[PDB]
């Protein structure tokens, strides 16, 4: 019976809530108050990257921490040299509306996607020169939000139709589809071991997936609005979510509970981009108040403000070696902070 | 040792800079429009987004139509903030209230608070039929129509019965009530009346864009 089905669902929800309560032996504040605060972390704009015409909705770092790819709404995909503020390539995309761009971990490929429901893989190490599409991935119903590379011939895409998909570029079809969300999936981050990935959607919940098994193992419900950005912790046993409720939350995968709520009465705007530092001590967050705010993940006390953008900050990512932070915002500038 | 690499890098940067300058010119030469609400408009102008290119008075317009996305719009509507105007095609023949608050949510969005909106009120023939005959649903789901009468500002170019005109301007003022309230020079919500037989919406959108860019130039060149 449908009412019996709802009763079973609510009984299971109560059981898991009771288990989570039993697993909350102590709070993060009690175990973290003893350590030294990180202090005021002030980093200046070490470099500004100009050349974009519209708001910058996506950016990504290379594995070398030296090459940078940025996606903006002018239908352009510029690959920058962060050290010498150059432009290795400028790929004109067929679809101007791009929300996600990906740099392959071994180079030679760059991905992009947006309101076209298509993830376009662009070959870099071509036989002769220039840049051309390698394969176009189609099948997603909603807009693509965040696509990240597993390796060559394997990509993971997040879409607005509540489903994430795993692809292989050579054949061109999906290997596994992920279902279980109610709202549009808005961001996606991969584990360092490339075995799991967490997706946050517009249903105020984040879910952990298994890439090959293809089912959702855990769900995390601690927010109160749409989650706009997710990011795995460097260790791989935690992640941080930013939502429209102006609260950043750190979730633990082995205790499926929220750990901290980095929030203030002053901050009303939501979080657009979230990225951890190399050690995970600092949790950089990009807000809609034309500011990026550097939190401390362990002690919820806020310890830094990256002022310098005059429009909404939408992109944020720490280098693979943790040497630079690039902040892409809606003023068509990529300021590199260090 | 690094001389050749640096020289090649600077040459590539110069080439990309020239390409980006040309793209800058072509990007500023064109205006972007969002079509929300609609097939007749895009048909008479000339996958998730259906591109449409048309040229009026030697100015390139880039209208964009969402056709493969879900009902939820609170996320992908934020990308259409730099567009010149959001073309809202209301039916205005209970779809009326849904269109009314789609317009309200567009109006009061903190990212569309600077983006102008063009209203069209697409249905006119069936509006005339519904006000001429039938059960008169216009007053059932909008009881204020009984008190409301034909405004004096109205110019009755089609000399039809007063009922269709008064209902049409009643819907228009219902939209303008939320357009004007909590609304200043950032946008204006240019209201228009259209239908299938209309073959001049291109000129209306063109003039609306002219006014929008005129206001932007006034704000930008300290002429206000």
């Amino acid at each position: 019976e449908l009412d019996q089905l709802r009763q079973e669902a609510e009984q299971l929800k109560n059981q898991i809530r009771d288990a989570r309560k039993a697993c909350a032996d102590a709070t993060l504040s009690q175990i973290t108050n003893n350590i030294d605060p990180v202090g005021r972390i002030q980093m200046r704009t070490r470099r500004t990257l100009r050349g974009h015409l519209a708001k910058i909705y996506a950016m990504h770092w290379g594995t070398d921490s030296r090459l940078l790819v940025s996606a903006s709404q002018d239908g352009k995909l510029i690959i920058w040299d962060s050290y010498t503020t150059n432009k290795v390539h400028a790929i004109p995309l067929r679809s101007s509306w791009v929300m996600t761009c990906a740099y392959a971990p071994s180079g030679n490929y760059v991905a992009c996607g947006g309101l076209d429901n298509i993830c376009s893989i662009y070959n870099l190490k071509t036989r002769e020169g220039n840049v051309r599409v390698s394969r176009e991935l189609a099948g997603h119903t909603g807009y693509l939000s965040c696509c990240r590379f597993l390796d060559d011939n394997q990509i993971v895409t997040s879409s607005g139709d509540t489903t994430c998909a795993l692809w292989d570029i050579e054949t061109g079809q999906q290997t596994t589809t992920f279902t279980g969300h109610t709202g549009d999936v808005m961001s996606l981050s991969l584990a360092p071991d490339t075995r799991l990935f967490v997706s946050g959607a517009c249903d105020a919940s984040a879910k952990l997936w298994d890439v090959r098994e293809g089912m959702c193992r855990q769900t995390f419900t601690g927010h109160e609005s749409d989650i706009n950005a997710i990011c795995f912790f460097p260790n791989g046993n935690a992640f941080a979510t930013g939502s429209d409720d102006a609260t950043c939350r750190l979730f633990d995968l082995r205790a499926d509970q929220e750990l901290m709520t980095y929030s203030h009465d002053n901050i009303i705007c939501g979080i657009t981009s979230v990225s951890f530092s190399k050690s995970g001590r600092l949790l950089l967050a990009g807000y809609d108040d034309f500011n990026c705010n550097v939190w401390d993940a362990l002690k919820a006390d806020r310890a830094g403000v990256l002022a310098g953008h005059d429009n909404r900050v939408s992109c944020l990512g720490v280098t693979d070696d943790g040497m630079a932070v690039a902040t892409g915002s809606w003023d068509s500038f990529l300021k590199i902070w260090n | 040792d690094q001389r050749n690499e640096e020289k090649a890098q600077r040459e590539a940067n110069k080439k990309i800079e020239k390409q980006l300058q040309k793209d800058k010119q072509v990007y500023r030469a064109t205006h972007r429009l969002l079509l929300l609400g609609k097939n007749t408009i895009v048909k008479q102008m000339r996958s998730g987004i259906f591109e449409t290119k048309f040229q009026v008075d030697k100015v390139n317009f880039h209208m964009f139509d969402v056709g493969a996305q879900r009902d939820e719009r609170r996320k992908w509507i934020q990308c259409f903030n730099d567009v010149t105007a959001i073309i809202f095609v209301v039916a205005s023949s209970n779809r009326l209230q849904a269109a009314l608050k789609l317009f309200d949510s567009i109006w009061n969005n903190k990212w569309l608070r600077d983006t102008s909106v063009i209203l069209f009120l697409n249905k006119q023939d069936l509006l005339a039929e519904k006000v001429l005959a039938g059960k008169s649903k216009i007053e059932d789901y909008f009881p204020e129509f009984a008190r409301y009468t034909t405004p004096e500002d109205a110019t009755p170019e089609p000399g039809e019965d007063p009922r269709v005109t008064r209902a049409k301007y009643f819907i228009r003022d219902e939209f303008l009530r939320i357009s004007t309230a909590s609304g200043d020079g950032r946008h204006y919500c240019y209201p228009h009346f259209t239908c299938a037989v209309d073959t001049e919406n291109i000129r209306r959108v063109f003039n609306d864009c002219r006014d929008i860019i005129q206001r932007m130039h006034l704000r930008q060149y300290e002429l206000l």
Partner: nanobody
């Protein structure tokens, strides 16, 4: 977890004055433009009544103008809608929807087919 558990229901003849509220939990109940959406038999989700964060800009649809009154008890986390002089026009399941974002004045997606912050309704036959 966001939850909007409705309460109330029961058959009434035309002119009935039955009512009951929601049981909203999981959020602050003070920064949201909550409203009411009812699905008619064989009809999509439409809106009837709306209230602001504090309870100032109370707006109604035409069919409910002068019939039902919206109430928002902040300290009691209940959208305490009162249905007076009910008519056999509604005969719908009522959902206490919530604004998608806090500290904002736009309910962009409230009447969609699927929506996270809507909750399970209660059928009010009439």
């Amino acid at each position: 977890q966001v939850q909007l558990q409705e309460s109330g229901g029961g058959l009434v003849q035309p002119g009935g004055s039955l009512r009951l509220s929601c049981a909203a939990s999981g959020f602050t109940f003070s920064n949201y433009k909550m409203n009411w959406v009812r699905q008619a038999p064989g009809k999509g989700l439409e809106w009837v009544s709306d209230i602001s964060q504090s309870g100032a800009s109370i707006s109604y649809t035409g069919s409910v103008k002068g019939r039902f009154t919206i109430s928002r008890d902040n300290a009691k986390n209940t959208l305490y809608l009162q249905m007076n002089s009910l008519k056999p026009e509604d005969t719908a399941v009522y959902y206490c929807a919530r604004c998608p974002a806090p500290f904002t004045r736009d309910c962009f997606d409230v009447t969609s087919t699927t929506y996270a912050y809507r909750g399970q309704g209660t059928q009010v036959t009439v």
